[PDB]
């Protein structure tokens, strides 16, 4: 049975997400205009989006039950390492299998392989990233399941530099158990089948995607011509 405490967690995470995720995408107007023409032409616009998207992932993280208990240094570690992965997870909403792109309501804000390529990331990242989006889409998660996964991704005990791992591990265990119990009670078969395992496999895919991004991000960022075009927050969080 799904406890009251467990049900409470889901209510909070759903709200948290609704406050941090705007399906209308109205704020993209604020970003530096996209350019599809031109090397790195998409970089300024996406750089802004990512920074915006980081800020929103931070706001989501804060509302996670038990996140506030951690030390700041631990708080910071978890965000720094999770941020890209959580962004990749969030983007599933905008992502459509119709044309393998992130569709944010308009051609200007619809993003494809080419646009990501124009932002200075290679296909070594993108093909496996796109494959992830398809595979996560294919799961057709309940919005309840989606928000829990993102939260589970942020509070991971094995992130490097975590002081108080046992607490981080306890916070996460509590969310895993909420997801696991949710799937049983509220996800009917056949969608239920192996669903928890398949979700954790996505965390595994994300670790790898994180790796590759870091690698490609260091290559972008070492050229100061490029670092100039990014936002200061993006510099802070990615390095």
């Amino acid at each position: 049975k799904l406890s009251e405490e467990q049900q409470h967690i889901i209510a909070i995470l759903l709200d948290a997400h609704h406050k941090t995720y705007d399906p209308t995408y109205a704020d993209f107007r604020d970003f530096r205009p996209p350019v599809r023409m031109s090397p790195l032409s998409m970089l300024p616009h996406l750089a802004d989006l990512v920074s915006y998207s980081i800020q929103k992932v931070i706001g989501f993280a804060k509302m996670i039950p038990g996140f506030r208990d951690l030390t700041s240094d631990d708080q910071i570690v978890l965000l720094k390492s999770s941020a890209i992965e959580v962004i990749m997870l969030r983007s599933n909403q905008s992502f459509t299998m119709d044309d393998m792109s992130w569709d944010c309501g308009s051609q200007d804000y619809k993003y494809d392989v080419t646009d990501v390529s124009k932002a200075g990331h290679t296909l070594e990242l993108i093909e496996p990233l796109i494959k992830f989006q398809v595979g996560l889409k294919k799961l057709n998660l309940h919005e309840e399941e989606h928000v829990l996964l993102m939260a589970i991704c942020i509070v991971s005990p094995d992130r490097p530099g975590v002081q108080d791992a046992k607490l981080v591990e306890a916070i996460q265990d509590r969310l895993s158990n909420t997801l696991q119990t949710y799937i049983r009670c509220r996800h009917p078969p056949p969608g239920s089948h192996q669903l928890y395992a398949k979700m954790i496999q996505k965390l595994a895919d994300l670790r790898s995607l994180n790796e590759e991004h870091s690698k490609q991000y260091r290559s972008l960022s070492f050229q100061p011509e490029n670092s100039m075009k990014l936002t200061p927050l993006v510099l802070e969080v990615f390095g």
Binding site: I58, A61, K62, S72, L79, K80, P232, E236
Partner: peptide
């Protein structure tokens, strides 16, 4: 060493 990240978490 993370003024912005820290400030956003505060």
């Amino acid at each position: 060493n993370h003024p912005m990240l820290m400030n956003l978490l505060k």
